[PDB]
Design a protein around this ligand. Structure first.
Ligand SMILES: [Mg+2]
Ligand SMILES: [Mg+2]
Ligand SMILES: [Mg+2]
Ligand SMILES: [Mg+2]
Lengths: 432, 432
């Protein structure tokens, strides 16, 4: 039923080239774009870049776009495969590439087509995208997730000293998704005043994901700022905190550098035990219920040890790279208890759904996520609703590559009407 | 032909509520959202806010949304008007409001419907949106504009002392629009390095429009940084500079405060002649070919005098507020020679086309513009192409509420194919 496929190079939220794909069926035009991370784990599927230093400093994706236009498209159009057959189409592309990490076509090439196919399939079935995703995942129910707003940005997403990547607020106590958005927005604007009053205007600019970028070095101060803003907005009893440390970014041959954005000096590196002690104090002093990538993507011993004594949600991101094989190892070792789901870390809609079901079958929570490099595409909004994970992180309530997702979730809630369910306090596992 | 209209509150790029409208015809659903400025001139049509300080700091727009749902929608649905009749529909709404500045419904309520009607009209005719706009404007030819990227932010859009609002680069020398995008992005990325090297990473976070927000005070330094980035990127031959002073933001009882973000002190204020000479020095030392709002919105004397002696494009923004009545006075006094076109400053597509035509008929250039508070809506991309103005400013190539428009422009150029035209160095008057 695929009449035509055409790919093109567009710009992501950081001004870098990325892949966009147009797919046509008798039902019309279906478009999707591909996100790109900044703190990408070594095990992520290959994001194929041109590496032509004269063009976009080597970041062009004309090669990936060409693999689609010259190879994937003609093949998919010939096979006359129906758009509702996501798995068959994804497997075909995976077989055509033939590599473990999608290094021939590029995961960005295959995902772009994979996403466009998924949207087309939904329309073909005459049902909303989230309902289509739900059918593909075998879910009867659908639910609105608690949003996790990254309101203070650090690490590789901002020009400050702050080593840890993301400081998030989750309105688990909200009555529904629209109130969750209200809480998120009001806390964010109050936080702007709190930071301005304490650090000045120069501290109120934003990072890649829309969070403020005060030039502080202390991660604890970031948490204190959140606590103050939450209090000022009056939602202390409805908001908990989440963090993405992105520890692989400051891993230094066994130790960790919490001041990695300053000229290198080994005298300040700390051990994973010392790093864990810091997390323990955070959990003690603030309502931190979730920590993502607390250690390096392959520092397996530290992960197991911390999760065993933590009491909270521990999210694997670079550890698991939305990859069934890495996830399975993590489940067996009890490395963590939550999967960060990033479709472009594995490269296809089908594999992403398999990663999600694998995590869930093992009792893990799943948090759907954007990449620091986003586009106006809103696929993940329907994805998290259809997969019923109950949690999604897709930015601070600032910069439209983030609001496009939150806005779409508002539209999904409205469409669901009075029967719309919201994860709320059951965000870790809206099932049970 | 309008079957249903339903409005809702969504979020803009700053995380503030704004209006979104869904409009249905037998051809389907058409959706549009409304932008919101920060440095808004006093003569702009009313952007209606709820002013309930307990909700979104007083910035909700539920009243505007209600004006559409309980008043405008049923009126339009009853009249059974054809969506291609833009002028009749806009006029009906203007008449229903009955006020000079659309303060009964709010310009945001009227514009939301106006835009959605326009999008439905194009599909009704089975023609691309820019073509429909071309038709409504009475244009046969269509052309890609030169993009003006606000790559360094100041004034009310950034956290720094920098008083002047926007520092833009225009790749007038590009071969086509896509190369214009490539040049814009490459210079932007080179600039991040130039700033980082001189002021450190903390100076590379971004303001509301995606431009870097360095901690500097001197506007000349802003220009100097752009020049360095342009040279470093190797495009000194293809890039010129534009500025948006937004002088109305620092107008102080007759004089001007170039440090208005620091604690007040009249002793630092300068006179309009001093400000005019400062611009002239800028025009002398840098490739500045365009300056927007060099003086206060009602400092008519200074405008006329400067426009007559500067030798460059002088853009009226808060001076004209996309208002034919203000524009008429400006043409008669030769207050400026270019119109900044902001649909939300007047409130309807029709008045916007009228304002554009009035300016163009008088030899004025016209630069289509976004607002500092944007959404994922891409209407102005088709608008500038359909109006053949030859120039558009819709942000730095950072933050998707900006790239959504640029990406759409890339899709239009692609769709136009071999017969695509680009204003290039003739941006001020693309159709000779
Ligand atoms: Mg990461
Ligand atoms: Mg991460
Ligand atoms: Mg302004
Ligand atoms: Mg302006």
């Amino acid at each position: 039923s695929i009449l035509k496929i055409h790919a093109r190079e567009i710009f992501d939220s950081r001004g870098n080239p990325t892949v966009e794909v147009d797919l046509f069926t008798s039902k019309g035009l279906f478009r999707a774009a591909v996100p790109s991370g900044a703190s990408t784990g070594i095990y992520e599927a290959l994001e194929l870049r041109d590496n032509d230093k004269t063009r976009y400093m080597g970041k062009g994706v004309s090669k990936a776009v060409e693999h689609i236009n010259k190879t994937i498209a003609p093949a998919l159009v010939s096979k006359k495969l129906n758009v509702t057959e996501q798995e068959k189409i994804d497997k075909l592309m995976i077989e055509m590439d033939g590599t473990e990490n999608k290094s021939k076509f590029g995961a960005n090439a295959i995902l772009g087509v994979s996403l466009a196919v998924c949207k087309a399939g939904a329309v073909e079935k005459g049902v909303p995208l989230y309902r289509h995703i739900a059918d593909l995942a075998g879910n009867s129910e659908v639910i609105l997730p608690v949003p996790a707003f990254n309101v203070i940005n650090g690490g590789s997403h901002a020009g400050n000293k702050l080593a840890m990547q993301e400081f998030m607020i989750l309105p688990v106590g909200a009555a529904n998704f629209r109130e969750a958005m209200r809480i998120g927005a009001e806390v964010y604007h109050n936080l702007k005043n709190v930071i301005k009053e304490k650090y000045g205007k120069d501290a109120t600019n934003v990072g890649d994901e829309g969070g403020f970028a005060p030039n502080i070095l202390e991660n604890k101060e970031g948490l204190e700022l959140l606590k103050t803003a939450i209090g000022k907005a009056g939602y202390t009893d409805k908001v908990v905190i989440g963090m993405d440390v992105a520890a692989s970014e400051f891993f230094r041959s066994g130790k960790y550098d919490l001041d990695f954005k300053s000229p290198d000096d080994p005298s300040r590196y700390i051990s994973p035990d010392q790093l864990a002690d810091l997390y323990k104090s955070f959990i003690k002093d603030y309502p931190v219920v979730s920590i993502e990538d607390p250690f390096d993507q392959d520092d397996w011993g530290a992960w197991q040890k911390f999760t065993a004594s933590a009491g909270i949600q521990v999210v694997g991101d670079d550890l698991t790279v939305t990859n069934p094989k890495r996830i399975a190892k993590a489940v067996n070792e009890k490395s963590c208890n939550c999967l960060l789901l990033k479709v472009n870390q594995i490269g296809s809609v089908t594999e992403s759904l398999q990663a999600c079901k694998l995590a869930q079958a093992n009792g893990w929570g799943v948090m759907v996520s954007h990449r620091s490099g986003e586009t106006e595409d809103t696929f993940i909004a329907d994805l998290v609703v259809g997969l019923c994970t109950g949690q999604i992180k897709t930015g601070a309530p600032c910069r439209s590559e983030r609001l496009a997702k939150y806005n779409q979730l508002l539209r999904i809630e409205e469409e669901l009407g009075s029967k719309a369910k919201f994860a709320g306090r059951n965000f870790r596992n809206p099932l049970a």
